[PDB]
């Protein structure tokens, strides 16, 4: 288990809801759109499929609640652009989702208390067309074409991310006004403090300390996290004590070259004439229509056919090649 060392964290999010910035427990790190099929590899601050006790459980996800990690339901997790996305794979900091045409991306969840936490980032999502036909549903039988996707396999063996020790977590609840002096309650934690008064103003303490002749607003206290690991996030500050001390962990769902099945458009009704070919097209979805001459001057012409259209094409002595969507190219030659 790799999740015993790593922990979920709180990071910056530009839109937590209504266009307001917050320290989100579901903050977006990196969105990968390298897959040609349309599958997105989303990176978040929380961990999915792991409980607070580090044990694996697909029905649960762990998020950072104020200062301590807490458990949340998997069913509450949602991904959306302009309309809700179809979830395909979830393990650790990573999410696999098939999204429709959108301008932004939102990743949300529901915690222990029924309160919705979401993070919105401006991401232009418009996956390219595989083949020559703009279809909606995936077919069981069709033309086999090369495409790339992030494999739904939970095992991590190829790709990796950088991990380091978390920075000093600031906490104002550590300091209290004891009559007219500052009282720092350690509570079994290594606390790093600094005061705007004389004497023992700063240092790294493991026990309770009392700052004489000082006010609560004049002091700053922080909890040190040296026992756990955290992703090298640009949304989280670097640890002040350690230099370039880093570690690395293998990440699930790597990119691999696969095969995408595409449907072939129905053959149009064809009629012939003197060095001319007439095709009565009937598309069910947007279909690419391309043609070229089989001689010295090819003169390539292409058009995306949307609905019922009649096409008049010229057939020279050298020949004419016509390609209707994902179908094999039709070849035409004149008689005599």
């Amino acid at each position: 288990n790799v999740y015993k060392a790593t922990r979920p964290y709180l990071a910056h999010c530009p839109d937590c809801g209504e266009g307001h910035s917050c320290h989100s427990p579901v903050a977006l790190e990196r969105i990968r759109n390298e897959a040609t099929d349309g599958t997105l590899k989303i990176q978040v601050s929380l961990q999915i499929g792991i409980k607070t006790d580090d044990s694996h459980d697909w029905t649960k996800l762990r998020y950072m609640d104020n200062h301590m990690p807490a458990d949340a339901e998997r069913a509450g997790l949602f991904v959306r652009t302009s309309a809700p996305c179809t979830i395909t794979g979830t393990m650790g900091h990573f999410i696999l989702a098939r999204c429709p045409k959108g301008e932004t991306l939102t990743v949300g969840f529901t915690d222990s208390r029924k309160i919705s936490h979401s993070c919105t980032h401006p991401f232009h999502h418009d996956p390219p067309v595989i083949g020559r036909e703009k279809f909606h549903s995936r077919p069981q039988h069709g033309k086999e074409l090369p495409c790339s996707t992030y494999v739904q396999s939970t095992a991590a063996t190829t790709e990796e991310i950088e991990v380091h020790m978390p920075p000093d977590t600031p906490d104002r609840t550590l300091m209290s006004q004891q009559s007219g002096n500052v009282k720092i309650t350690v509570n079994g934690q290594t606390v790093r403090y600094k005061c705007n008064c004389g004497g023992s103003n700063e240092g790294l303490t493991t026990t309770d300390k009392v700052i004489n002749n000082c006010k609560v607003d004049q002091c700053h206290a922080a909890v040190t996290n040296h026992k756990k690991w955290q992703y090298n996030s640009p949304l989280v500050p670097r640890n002040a004590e350690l230099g370039d001390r880093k570690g690395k962990i293998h990440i699930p769902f790597p990119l691999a070259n696969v095969t995408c099945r595409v449907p072939k458009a129905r053959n149009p009704t064809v009629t012939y004439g003197k060095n001319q070919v007439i095709m009565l097209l009937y598309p069910d979805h947007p279909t690419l229509l391309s043609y070229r001459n089989m001689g010295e001057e090819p003169n390539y012409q292409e058009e995306w056919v949307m609905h019922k259209k009649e096409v008049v094409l010229t057939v020279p002595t050298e020949g004419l090649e016509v390609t209707w969507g994902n179908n094999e190219p039709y070849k035409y030659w004149p008689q005599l």
Binding site: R32, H220, P234, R292
Partner: protein
């Protein structure tokens, strides 16, 4: 110990061509030849590969009550900046004690993405192309396949017959001096050279191989000042040139190339390019030839055409009556170039008749048929076909 027959056929795939072999003193022989595939493989030289770039940004070094210092690192597109008078905030309040004397160090570099192993475009330099052909020959009543280089030097012996294909009449290639390959698509592109890539365009990130250690980068990476009370590394950068090329590339050589060229990859090649002609030399052995005396003599020949349609295919039927000296095999060939006969060899015996299929474009076709060593005149009145356009060459 044989006879060398030299003939020239047009460089067109899927058309059966007939050739008459006439060795002096020996009975004629008819051979049917069909080009199955003509492959033009260019000699490649990889310059570089391009893929999606990865902007590696570590956690920003926030120095409370002090100044941070940027060090020059030997990294591609390495950017470093120290911002003064910062006051960032975390979940439980401010991160720094001071208010005006805090600094933030922002650093970022550009390298190859994880996808570069799978998703990449290769920039090749095409040299002298190699020609090769797959030919089907109907020799002695059996179909034989000959695969040889179309250079007029590579000899392939199939059933004791030596075959020499080429040299090609046209040295034409659909590929230019500089080509770009993506999966199964080839593009004729004048790509930028190594170390001369521009931001937001093809070649913004350059590397020798998809697994290479060093990488060239020019993406115009500029680091920006972070937002008030926010820990983040904002930056201005030109988007992926490879990602922009994937939607702006247009049609590949498979759809744009002249002469009806079919483009394939692994290795890159031009398949079935209908350009020029192809010379074929066949060294037929002694055993295959039969003497005119040992061959049946054909006398009292007459021809009748009961059905004909002038089309690209064999739309004509001809019945030839004959009187033979003995039983044996005779070669059938058309002496008129406007008419072509489907049959190459038929069995001849006594006072009998033969049926032949023929193709012509003429309305009134007057052609001579040579059965063995004797000729017969055929009178054909062929009618127009059903369709003006056909789906076969």
């Amino acid at each position: 110990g044989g006879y060398e027959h030299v003939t020239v056929i047009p460089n067109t795939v899927g058309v059966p061509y007939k050739t008459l072999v006439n060795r002096p003193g020996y009975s004629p022989m008819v051979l049917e030849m069909e080009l199955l595939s003509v492959t033009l493989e260019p000699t490649l030289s990889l310059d570089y590969i391009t893929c999606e770039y990865k902007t590696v940004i570590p956690s920003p070094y926030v120095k409370c009550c002090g100044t941070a210092e940027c060090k020059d690192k030997n990294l591609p597109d390495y950017s470093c900046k120290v911002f003064t008078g910062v006051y960032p905030f975390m979940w439980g309040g401010a991160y720094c004690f001071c208010d005006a004397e805090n600094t933030q160090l922002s650093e970022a570099h550009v390298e190859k993405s994880e996808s570069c192993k799978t998703e990449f475009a290769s920039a090749y330099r095409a040299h002298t192309a190699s020609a090769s052909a797959k030919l089907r020959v109907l020799y002695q009543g059996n179909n034989i396949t000959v695969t040889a280089y179309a250079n007029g030097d590579h000899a392939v012996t199939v059933k004791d017959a030596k075959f020499i294909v080429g040299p090609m009449s046209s040295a034409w290639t659909p590929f230019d001096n500089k080509i770009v390959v993506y999966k199964g698509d080839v593009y004729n592109m004048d790509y930028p050279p190594f170390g001369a890539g521009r931001p937001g365009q093809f070649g913004d990130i350059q590397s020798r191989t998809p697994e290479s250690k060093d990488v060239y980068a020019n993406t115009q990476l500029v680091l920006q000042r972070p937002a008030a009370g926010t820990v983040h590394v904002p930056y201005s950068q030109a988007p992926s040139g490879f990602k922009y090329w994937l939607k702006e590339r247009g049609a590949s050589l498979q759809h744009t190339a002249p002469f009806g060229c079919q483009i394939a990859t692994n290795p890159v090649r031009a398949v079935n390019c209908a350009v020029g002609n192809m010379p074929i030399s066949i060294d037929i052995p002694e055993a295959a030839f039969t003497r005119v005396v040992d061959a049946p003599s054909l006398t009292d020949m007459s021809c009748e055409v009961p059905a004909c349609t002038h089309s690209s295919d064999f739309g004509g039927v001809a019945i030839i009556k004959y009187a033979a000296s003995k039983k044996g095999k005779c070669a059938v060939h058309s002496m008129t170039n406007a008419v072509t006969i489907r049959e190459a060899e038929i069995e001849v015996e006594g006072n009998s008749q033969l049926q032949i299929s023929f193709s012509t474009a003429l309305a009134s076709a007057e052609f001579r048929v040579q059965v063995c060593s004797t000729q017969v005149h055929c009178a054909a009145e062929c009618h127009p076909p059903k369709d003006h356009i056909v789906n076969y060459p």
